[PDB]
Amino acid sequence: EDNEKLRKPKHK
Amino acid sequence: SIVMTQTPKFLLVSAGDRVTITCKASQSVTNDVTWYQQKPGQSPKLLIYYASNRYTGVPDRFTGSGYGTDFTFTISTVQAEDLAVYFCQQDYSSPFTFGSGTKLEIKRTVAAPSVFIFPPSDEQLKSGTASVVCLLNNFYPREAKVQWKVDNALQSGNSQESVTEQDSKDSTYSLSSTLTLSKADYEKHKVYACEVTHQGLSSPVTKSFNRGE
Amino acid sequence: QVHLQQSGGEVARPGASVKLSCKASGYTFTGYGLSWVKQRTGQGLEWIGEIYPRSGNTYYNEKFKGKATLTADKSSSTAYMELRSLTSEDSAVYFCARSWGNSSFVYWGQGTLVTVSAASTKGPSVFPLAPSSKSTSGGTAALGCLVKDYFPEPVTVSWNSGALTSGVHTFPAVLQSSGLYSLSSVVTVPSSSLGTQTYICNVNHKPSNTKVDKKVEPKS
Ligand SMILES: *[C@@H]1O[C@H](CO[C@@H]2O[C@@H](C)[C@@H](O)[C@@H](O)[C@@H]2O)[C@@H](O[C@@H]2O[C@H](CO)[C@@H](O)[C@H](O)[C@H]2NC(C)=O)[C@H](O)[C@H]1NC(C)=O
Numbered sequence A: 001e002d003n004e005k006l007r008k009p010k011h012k
Numbered sequence B: 001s002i003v004m005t006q007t008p009k010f011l012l013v014s015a016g017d018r019v020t021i022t023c024k025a026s027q028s029v030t031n032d033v034t035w036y037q038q039k040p041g042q043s044p045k046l047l048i049y050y051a052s053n054r055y056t057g058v059p060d061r062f063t064g065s066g067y068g069t070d071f072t073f074t075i076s077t078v079q080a081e082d083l084a085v086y087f088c089q090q091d092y093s094s095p096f097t098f099g100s101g102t103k104l105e106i107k108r109t110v111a112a113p114s115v116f117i118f119p120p121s122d123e124q125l126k127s128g129t130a131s132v133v134c135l136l137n138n139f140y141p142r143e144a145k146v147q148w149k150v151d152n153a154l155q156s157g158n159s160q161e162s163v164t165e166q167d168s169k170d171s172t173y174s175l176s177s178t179l180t181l182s183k184a185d186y187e188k189h190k191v192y193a194c195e196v197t198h199q200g201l202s203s204p205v206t207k208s209f210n211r212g213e
Numbered sequence C: 001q002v003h004l005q006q007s008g009g010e011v012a013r014p015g016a017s018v019k020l021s022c023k024a025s026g027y028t029f030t031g032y033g034l035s036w037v038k039q040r041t042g043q044g045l046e047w048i049g050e051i052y053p054r055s056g057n058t059y060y061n062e063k064f065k066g067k068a069t070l071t072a073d074k075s076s077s078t079a080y081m082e083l084r085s086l087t088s089e090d091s092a093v094y095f096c097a098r099s100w101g102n103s104s105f106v107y108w109g110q111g112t113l114v115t116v117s118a119a120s121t122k123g124p125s126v127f128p129l130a131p132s133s134k135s136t137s138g139g140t141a142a143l144g145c146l147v148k149d150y151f152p153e154p155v156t157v158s159w160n161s162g163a164l165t166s167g168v169h170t171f172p173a174v175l176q177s178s179g180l181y182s183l184s185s186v187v188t189v190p191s192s193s194l195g196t197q198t199y200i201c202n203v204n205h206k207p208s209n210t211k212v213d214k215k216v217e218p219k220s
Helices: A002-012 B183-187
Strands: B004-007 B010-015 B017-025 B032-036 B046-051 B063-069 B069-076 B086-090 B102-107 B113-119 B129-139 B147-152 B158-164 B173-182 B191-197 B205-210 C003-005 C008-014 C020-026 C034-039 C045-052 C057-060 C069-072 C077-083 C092-100 C105-108 C114-117 C124-128 C140-150 C155-157 C167-169 C179-189 C200-205 C211-216
Touching: B004 B086, B017 B032, B017 C008, B017 C092, B017 C140, B032 B063, B046 B063, B046 C124, B063 C003, B069 B086, B086 C020, B102 C057, B113 C140, B129 B191, B129 C057, B129 C140, B147 B158, B147 B183, B147 B205, B147 C020, B158 C140, B173 B183, B173 B191, B173 C179, B183 C167, B205 C077, C003 C092, C003 C105, C008 C020, C008 C077, C020 C092, C034 C077, C045 C069, C057 C069, C077 C092, C124 C211, C140 C200, C155 C167
Parallel strands: B010 B102, C008 C114
Antiparallel strands: B004 B017, B017 B069, B032 B046, B032 B086, B063 B069, B086 B102, B113 B129, B129 B173, B147 B191, B158 B173, B191 B205, C003 C020, C020 C077, C034 C045, C034 C092, C045 C057, C069 C077, C092 C105, C092 C114, C124 C140, C140 C179, C155 C200, C167 C179, C200 C211
């Protein structure tokens, strides 16, 4: 896994 | 998007002085603010993250603080090597946005330039052009007057100057002035001289050579 | 041991495209999001977009949609950004920066300078600035290399393959009337050492794939 799930809230 | 307003735009301080940079966000960004140091030529270097945490290996003199919209960055005692542009950045939401940057410059005691002159190389003369370089090394402050004389006639219109960034060790500047002539023009004269005026010199200095000698 | 190695500076024609590369080493490429950042020299930094090499998923700054396309190649651990329909406003330095945790730009590449121009690339001529009795001061001598007539920027200069750094000054380029650039790199050394020490400037102009060494000796 990568850190996309961690950083997803920053893109909303 | 979120706007980061960074102030001041420049600082001129002496080694050992304290400096504080401020960054204000257009809306709350909690604590997710990063501070970067960008030295000339280099990529930005992360110093402070989550508003107040030093990155690994960052000296103790760098701190940050803030939560919400107002954030500050502090260098407790500025060192010569801290010459750089510093940036704040909000990492709270996309698009991730930076401040406009603060240029930290150092003031120091007056230093006279050491002056050197270089004739054109024999290799360059083969190509039909002659570049004469006058070098002013490690002086302060930046202001300096360089004048070219060829057979004691003041030159206009055939030279270009370039000054370095401030030195990370001794806070000085260096400057070149390059006189460019065709080979034929170069061969028609004998004495090539650059005359340097600077606050650290008691009187103007001239460095000269004789073509061929 | 994270390292991001970006491709060299390039000229590219207006209206054309250019593809920049960012080769990653020292970590698992698919582990972390990777962004690209634009800097105009002396001005601010702008986030372009982010890609996650595990999935290929991309997120763009709205302003760069239709300008920039981010891709990645797992097999070579390389990230790419292609800029299309180039204009004068696309001339800038472009960085790649790698994420960590939820933080966006923790590890940075060295940057790639893009110059948008229809002019052809031209490698530099390198000439010695020889030490002589006219380049001595307080027992020191100065010497250097003149790096003349290249396009586009940048040129880099090392001395003795990177072993000589103390006292070096490499000047910012000047723009000549011809539209080509010129700079010099200089160093101050002991005047006592001119007969026994060797001083070689190493000039690299990546936009033309030109690498030149020049030994600088005192004038006979
Ligand atoms: C981005 O992450 C930081 C840090 O998160 C913590 O540390 C990580 C290593 C991981 O272990 C996480 O699970 C941790 O929560 C967040 O900062 C923290 O936020 C919490 C509240 O959410 C707060 O109680 C902590 O004090 C904060 N820690 C610090 C050092 O400031 C931050 O909120 C995250 N950003 C976003 C937008 O979610």
